Amino acid sequence: KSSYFDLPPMEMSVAFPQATPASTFPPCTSDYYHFNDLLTPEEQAIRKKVRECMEKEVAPIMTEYWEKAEFPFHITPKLGAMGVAGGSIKGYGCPGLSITANAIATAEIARVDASCSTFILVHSSLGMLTIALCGSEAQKEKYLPSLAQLNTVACWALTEPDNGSDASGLGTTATKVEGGWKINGQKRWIGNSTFADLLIIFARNTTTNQINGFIVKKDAPGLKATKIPNKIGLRMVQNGDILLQNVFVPDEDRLPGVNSFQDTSKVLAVSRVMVAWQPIGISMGIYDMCHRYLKERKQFGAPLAAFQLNQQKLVQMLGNVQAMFLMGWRLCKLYETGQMTPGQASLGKAWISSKARETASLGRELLGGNGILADFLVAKAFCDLEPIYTYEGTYDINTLVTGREVTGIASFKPAT
Amino acid sequence: KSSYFDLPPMEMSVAFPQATPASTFPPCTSDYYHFNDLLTPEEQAIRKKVRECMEKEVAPIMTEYWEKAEFPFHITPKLGAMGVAGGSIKGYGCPGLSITANAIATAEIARVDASCSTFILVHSSLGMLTIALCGSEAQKEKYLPSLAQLNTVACWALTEPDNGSDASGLGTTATKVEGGWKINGQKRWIGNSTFADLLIIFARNTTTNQINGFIVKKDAPGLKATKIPNKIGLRMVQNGDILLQNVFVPDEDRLPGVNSFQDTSKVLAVSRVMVAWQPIGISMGIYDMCHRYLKERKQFGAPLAAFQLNQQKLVQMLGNVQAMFLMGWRLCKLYETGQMTPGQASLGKAWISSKARETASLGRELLGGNGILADFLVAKAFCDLEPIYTYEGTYDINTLVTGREVTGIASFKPAT
Amino acid sequence: KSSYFDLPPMEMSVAFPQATPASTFPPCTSDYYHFNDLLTPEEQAIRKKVRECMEKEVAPIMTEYWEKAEFPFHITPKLGAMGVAGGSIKGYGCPGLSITANAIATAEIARVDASCSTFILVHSSLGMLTIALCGSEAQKEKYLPSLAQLNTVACWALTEPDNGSDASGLGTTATKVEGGWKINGQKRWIGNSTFADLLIIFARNTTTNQINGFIVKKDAPGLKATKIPNKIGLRMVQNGDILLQNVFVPDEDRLPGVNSFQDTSKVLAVSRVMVAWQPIGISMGIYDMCHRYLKERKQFGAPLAAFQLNQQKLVQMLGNVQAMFLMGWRLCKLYETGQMTPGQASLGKAWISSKARETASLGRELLGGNGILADFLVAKAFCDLEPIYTYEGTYDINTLVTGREVTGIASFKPAT
Amino acid sequence: KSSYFDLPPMEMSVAFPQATPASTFPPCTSDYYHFNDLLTPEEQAIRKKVRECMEKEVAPIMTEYWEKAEFPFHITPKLGAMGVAGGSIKGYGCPGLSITANAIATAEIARVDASCSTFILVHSSLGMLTIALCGSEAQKEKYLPSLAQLNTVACWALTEPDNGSDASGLGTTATKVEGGWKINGQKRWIGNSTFADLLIIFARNTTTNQINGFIVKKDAPGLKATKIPNKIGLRMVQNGDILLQNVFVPDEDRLPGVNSFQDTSKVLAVSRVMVAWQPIGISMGIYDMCHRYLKERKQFGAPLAAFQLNQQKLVQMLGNVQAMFLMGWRLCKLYETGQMTPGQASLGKAWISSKARETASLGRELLGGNGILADFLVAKAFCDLEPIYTYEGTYDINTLVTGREVTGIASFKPAT
Numbered sequence A, B, C, D: 001k002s003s004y005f006d007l008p009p010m011e012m013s014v015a016f017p018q019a020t021p022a023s024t025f026p027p028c029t030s031d032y033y034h035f036n037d038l039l040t041p042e043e044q045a046i047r048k049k050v051r052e053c054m055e056k057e058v059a060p061i062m063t064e065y066w067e068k069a070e071f072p073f074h075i076t077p078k079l080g081a082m083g084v085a086g087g088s089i090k091g092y093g094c095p096g097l098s099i100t101a102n103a104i105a106t107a108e109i110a111r112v113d114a115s116c117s118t119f120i121l122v123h124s125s126l127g128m129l130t131i132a133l134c135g136s137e138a139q140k141e142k143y144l145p146s147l148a149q150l151n152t153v154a155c156w157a158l159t160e161p162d163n164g165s166d167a168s169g170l171g172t173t174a175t176k177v178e179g180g181w182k183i184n185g186q187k188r189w190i191g192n193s194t195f196a197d198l199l200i201i202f203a204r205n206t207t208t209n210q211i212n213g214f215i216v217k218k219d220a221p222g223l224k225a226t227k228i229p230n231k232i233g234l235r236m237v238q239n240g241d242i243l244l245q246n247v248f249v250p251d252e253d254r255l256p257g258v259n260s261f262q263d264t265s266k267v268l269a270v271s272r273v274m275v276a277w278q279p280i281g282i283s284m285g286i287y288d289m290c291h292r293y294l295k296e297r298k299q300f301g302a303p304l305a306a307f308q309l310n311q312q313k314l315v316q317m318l319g320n321v322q323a324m325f326l327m328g329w330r331l332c333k334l335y336e337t338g339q340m341t342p343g344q345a346s347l348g349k350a351w352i353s354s355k356a357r358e359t360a361s362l363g364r365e366l367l368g369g370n371g372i373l374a375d376f377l378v379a380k381a382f383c384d385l386e387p388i389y390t391y392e393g394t395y396d397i398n399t400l401v402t403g404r405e406v407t408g409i410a411s412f413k414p415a416t
Ligand SMILES: Cc1cc2nc3c(=O)[nH]c(=O)nc-3n(C[C@H](O)[C@H](O)[C@H](O)COP(=O)(O)OP(=O)(O)OC[C@H]3O[C@@H](n4cnc5c(N)ncnc54)[C@H](O)[C@@H]3O)c2cc1C
Pocket: A297, A299, A300, A304, A307, A308, A309, A310, A365, A366, A367, A368, A369, A370, A372, B122, B156, B157, B158, B159, B163, B164, B165, B166, B188, B189, B190, B191, B234, B239, B387, B390, B391, B392, B393, B394, B395, B396, B397, B412, B413
């Protein structure tokens, strides 16, 4: 204890005057290859709209809510006001955007905050889309409209403690009963699960021994989703462990499209493209912050940006960014032309996430001390990126998916 | 909100049964080149003692206190029971260890927790040692005995918001008054400062225009140290912003050894060696955890350690570790023989911290999902390492110190 | 000596049957993101034409001539038959291609052989273009037609032993005499110089103290260009040391466009873009070879492409390639739109050359033993790439050019 | 053709005066951690002796013979005068050195030239040692004395075109005949084979279906060893393809120790340690050259060693070197204490060779243009290192050997 131990933290205005925190978000200096040429007039407008609605409403409060690992619920309606939820889904009260537009949207969110980016992505590109492609016409018209407006929040539940990367061999059972199903099993890592209204839980149809999709409602008897604590990244994203004991799902709430796991590998085709755009966004932000910081912070009687070592670090980031964008952009134009294959998308996410790590690592050390402060974005984004490298297919798995497709030989399984 | 939103987190026994958390700390499988051969019988005994007293008393509680960013005060006496505080200092109620022993001690702490390692290092190798080398015989006999037993905690205050890497050009003034001094200025990043009894504050002697050392007592009128929040690493270490308004320091509490900043560069010679040993420790822990995890966690019907990609990652870590140790060991044997130069020590810290990052980065991705959980050590240590890469001389500064010494040409300042 | 010491090398058919050498060049499996979409119908046709005319006429003989470090002169007319020399130059008997087309042309040459790529690039993009932009209408109509058909070969002479990266401070003097000039000085590294008909030598106009361009004819009295030996890369490219003792250049053969070094920085704008495309080409070839080799060579009772470690290496190359291409492609579309700046082009070359090294390094180790054989392309290209990383602006210089432009602060000069 | 095309290359004194070539070899500035402390008085004397006898007799001529890919036979007796051949072998006219001494000897050779280092290593650590451990007392007393003096040269023949990394499944047959054996099969990559007096050829004992060792004499009827051309590294090392048609080996010339391939894995235990020391040596040389070059070559009105970017590159090399040495040193002290295991040695070679590549890559780019010239060592050593990364167990194989030992699970074979 001390007479000054209880006193509130020093204001950033007094504690470190030389540099401007992320509270007032940096200008877009990462767009060095003038990317608006690769975007359509409408895509450009969505890009600008999201960017502004993020620097205004999320940028100030994000620093506080990340430390507390609490979700900023009062921001939800502001995100549904951007018109991004639903994204790729056409009709059913959804914006109906192009894959390039829905991707550049994700970017300009992850740029300011990766946490709020994953929240929407899991809800929109995994939750909503699964209903939009595998659901029935009765389900699409029922749920989607409210989900696109963010009045109701959905979550995607494929992963288990026992089965992660080997997702196709999951152990949650879906026993057929009169009038519906009884879902029994456990889930781990599901974002939004602790507060989600709709829980798209994947389970094993005990009759067919195949994987089926189920829309599980909130608070449903036998369902218990508890918060996963102590995350170093994506701290605002409420990830949880789901328990399922005789959870009833009526025949009307089973997804008719999912009848094996191969059916899921059409939703993932969009999901993998969209996740691939998160690092593209994050890295841009990391640069934008570094560019300003190195120009504001003075040491040895000169801005940091004047020193050879710092410049080489900055341009390596700038170079990594330009390539990462073009990579993700091309990936979209492959999906749009309808000639995109699992391997191309798996290469996309893997490569981009890898260079994003390098870019984040350089950015983090460039700010030195304040490089470990979430006040200055880079530190938060450095941490925020680590799960992204792993989730939606770990680097190693993706590189092996692209491996299998190109070589023609599968090398996933062990020897034995 | 939800009926299950408020419910406590799922126990690790139920949430993820396949793997054992850091609560029960991993066995020492990182010692692959059998390092006990490089240590003396007495050094070996200190190594073992600390390791055990860390896996017992810190290992269980560390996960909880890291998330809360709170210091575990009830552990303090247990650390002072290890007989590590003081370390290199001979006499004055200190253990009187060899530089190799005091280094291997730091390692086996940082191995289990980097936070508690920095706490002691700043207290012992920076605080206590400054008094031991630059203090008067009257000061050494007065403070050191209590500081070695951890009844009183000391902190080192050189860095400022305006002056960080350019430490020799600091702006905290030490105006001479009748009977003592009036310290005026600001400090940033000082570990333990918020609860430290002794504050070794460096200020500019306004009469000589040189840097002098001052022992500032706790609660002293005009002194205000506030906690720095939102750190991604070393979260338990209470780092703070120090304010100083006409803080009186009597003539008896001025360090007579510090007459310019060059005098400090004899304390730093030990401090830089000791910090260099933190990554060596941390990385060993990161390995020990990975080795078990890859052997416990099963996927695709085999332990993770069976897959080619995972093995190459693991052995790269094992290789990085063996070299890091030998590097730090040699560094000690250079200081011990008395032929160590600033450049050698600067190369030591820089190189080791660099490979520690690589080792931590691999380790973090090896655990996949649980790679972002502080429950599993790696994530915490991954974050914990980032400030260490920067503090006690940033990588770039150190590489330039070694640069200046070898080439003969100084390349720190800008052009202009 | 031995009874078998003098005997000719074993045929590749008997010495290593499992794999096919570069003699029969690999199919295009590096084009994974289907790049023909980014090219125009005419650009596609040039791409195909060059690729075929390289796999037929150069691919067999390249292995032999690289080892001997001799230029394949009997291939010259076959290269001038492709219609690539001149490239960007409109009229004057030149093909008049787009910057994207002239870039994709360079790629499909460097793909098969980097040596023959540099030969043409130095001749066309540096030699011919300098005349086309800085020469007089009388000079353009006189030389260019024959240079485009490869009946006459030109070389570019800016670099000196004393002045390399600091090119603007060169020491070759151009003393004004009656009716012309007397060029005095030394040059180093000039490709084609030993056999070039036209030598575009840059010298210092002693009257204005500025840099001027001079067309020096072959065999001119006082001129002596000797071959530089012992190169590990670009061995077929005849690089030489040029000596100049009172070499007369008539007033008609002075380039009227070059009156300071700033005038050169418009030719370099194309030259830097074109060099940036060499690694893009080379790396594609390196992949194409690896993809086949890993599928042909069998070990442990399976093709190399079946092993996890080898796949991860291959896909990292494939990923590096797709990005490198998009990067160079975008760079062209920046020059084409006329909004390209020195910094963007400097980022292009730097980044691409850097990833090309990584890609080459992986490719070289993938072939193992035969990875050091020029018979198998990769080894040759691995070596061939090293000068490219350095010449046309070293990585460090380029990263500093992009540094200066973005930050606004120049950090080229030393302290002192 | 030209009047100056046939003229001999420009002397290095005139062509590039600013820097000193490798002809006059650089001073030892790579020994930054003062390594003579880790060596015995006798080891120090051997280190110095070899270093001097290399800088005098090999250093001038190496540049010429590397380009021509010819072996400098007139240097052989000078190498046998150093007293290094035999090395570890006790008695039988061999020097009888310690493993640490024989390793530091290899280093100080590979430092000046890697080619001459491999020549001796294959002869001494693979050839001679195989006889010393697996040969009979009659064979040791017969061959070794002459082999240690370098009057006779031996070579090691395990690898085949069909079987490389999978060495234990080789296909050279050893059919038993009256009075001896008939060796039938093919070999590839054998150093010295084209001029070696003794050819230690490994073949499959057709009776036991196991691997046996055979001493095949030079010029033996049915034996034909042809030179392998077009190598980018170790160009002086005469590597060859061996043909064997009914080559008779009398019962007296069969190695009685080699009864299966497991017996070989005691010779390799020394061979792998010794190869591991080649990069340690090479990298030291690469540094020593860079340190001088960056201090001699001036650009922008300052030595290259004055620029931040160049210093960071240089110290990364210096750091990589100090660790590489300690790593190899520790490895020796593990073999010496008799507690070294295949995995430790496999980690040694793998890790060291990996960092040697990094160190060589940096060194090569530091010299810029002259970084591709064998005149300046770095380029030659950069190339020379590439096979070393692969031969004596490729990086991937070694990392998997260390993988198997630590994890307990073997991951060499494919699935299928
Ligand atoms: C958690 C933690 C605990 C700490 N505890 C203490 C403590 O107890 N006591 C104490 O005194 N200090 C402490 N520090 C502060 C630390 O000493 C400083 O952060 C560091 O020494 C200087 O970095 P900076 O924050 O001032 O950033 P800067 O000095 O501004 O450096 C930022 C970046 O600029 C680069 N740079 C700076 N100068 C040059 C140059 N000349 N040439 C090329 N590049 C350059 C650096 O490489 C760095 O990446 C602590 C820091 C941390 C993170």
